[PDB]
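@here heads up, posting the sequence + SMILES for the UMA run so it's all in one place. Ping me if the SMILES looks off, I pulled it from an old spreadsheet.
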Amino acid sequence: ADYQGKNVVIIGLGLTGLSCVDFFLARGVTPRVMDTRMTPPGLDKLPEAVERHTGSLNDEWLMAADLIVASPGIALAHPSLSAAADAGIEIVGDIELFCREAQAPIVAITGSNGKSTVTTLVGEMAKAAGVNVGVGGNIGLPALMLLDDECELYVLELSSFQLETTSSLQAVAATILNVTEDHMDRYPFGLQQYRAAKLRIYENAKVCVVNADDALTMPIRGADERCVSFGVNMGDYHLNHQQGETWLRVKGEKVLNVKEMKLSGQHNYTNALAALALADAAGLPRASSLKALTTFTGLPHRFEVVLEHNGVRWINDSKATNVGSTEAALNGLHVDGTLHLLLGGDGKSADFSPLARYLNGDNVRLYCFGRDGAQLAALRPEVAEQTETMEQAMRLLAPRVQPGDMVLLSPACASLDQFKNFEQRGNEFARLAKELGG
Ligand SMILES: CC(=O)N[C@H]1[C@@H](OP(=O)(O)OP(=O)(O)OC[C@H]2O[C@@H](n3ccc(=O)[nH]c3=O)[C@H](O)[C@@H]2O)O[C@H](CO)[C@@H](O)[C@@H]1O[C@H](C)C(=O)N[C@@H](C)C(=O)O
Ligand SMILES: CC(=O)Nc1ccc(Sc2ccc3nnc(N)n3n2)cc1
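bot reply: prediction finished. Complex structure tokens:
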């Protein structure tokens, strides 16, 4: 692509928008930037020479643009952005800009849960093989910052939002790990509209890696000659369970006894399968890929033990921003005493009812906070308490914690109503756990 001389308008003054500003300036194009927020976070980091507009979308700028670059946080359905599309003005996102420039193969990963773990695993498999790898996207390092003529493989975590604005991705290997309700505040045509965004990841992919146990991860025309599957009891990549022992298997052959992994839980074993399938499709050597599965210890804020003291584990699962992610934490969870479960934040219009079946019995207490705290407490009112904030909830539960108990922050909601992001929520939880638990 050649952007010289074009009128380029960027929407969003977050991490993505700032990376796009730098991308265009480095190519001799001065963009303009706007954001609907009155005081967006990147305002102070924006170079002084770049014109900016805040507090609304500016139609004078959008309707004059040759190219609109939309951050994932702005809906294409915004009336001003929809008006620009109606006029035939080209709209792309940062991932599109990246794909147009990338000079190495791309592994592309989406899904409602597991995507950062799988993305990081594939990156570790590449590193173990001695491959110069760039890992980024929705995981938190904007993709345009990865561009490097020495990079030999890119591994991108992609959201549904990013995929909506991407048209030129031709992944060497692509997966949808699973599809469960999320972002319904952005998808007024429901689960299938969200799914449709994710299905874009398979377009022009050389290999598609699908979940044999989740039919919504399959292309609408069905699985085809490009499709490799993973699953629990079936799939090209699957699990074999025996007497307290689980193996990763590929087409009937054992490849790894999961006792060698540092992650645990069935969903992390299927994450390992998906990562291996992607790595195999990208041509990475099997032996080094298996080694990486044994060295990876997990991501911050993803079922992370932040304190184990006095017989109590305090677990930061702040990255559980949807119901399916909290279900993965709860399903199969063993607690000797009482589970003190922190739920709350901005639920994004989700139905929380799938969580109720994990919340029966006498050894569970709920502490519900944030915007949707009342809806979460309604899952089982007789064991639930509601506060405004997570700190209030933690100070309420801490006196009740007994040896053998678990305190689990797995909130099923976004943090943006009260926190900068899920990392700040997790860091605040960890600080409070250390104060209250030691
Ligand atoms: C919301 C989203 O898609 N965030 C991803 C984005 O971060 P960035 O800081 O660029 O976000 P953004 O596009 O500026 O939007 C952030 C917030 O600002 C709001 N916003 C944005 C632009 C605007 O004009 N008005 C406005 O109100 C959005 O509604 C959103 O709540 O780009 C980063 C780099 O690719 C990602 O790491 C980050 O993923 C975060 C982790 C995330 O929450 N992603 C969602 C999709 C998820 O995982 O569920
Ligand atoms: C079998 C099934 O459920 N298929 C399906 C596929 C896509 C959608 S999403 C959609 C549908 C209409 C529409 N009109 N305008 C917009 N933006 N949309 N989006 C829903 C259902």
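MO: DSSP finds 13 helices and 20 strands in the chain.
MO: One more: Residues 11-12, 14-17, 35-37, 71-74, 137-138, 140, 142, 159, 161, 321, 416 surround UMA (ligand 1) (CB under 6 Å).
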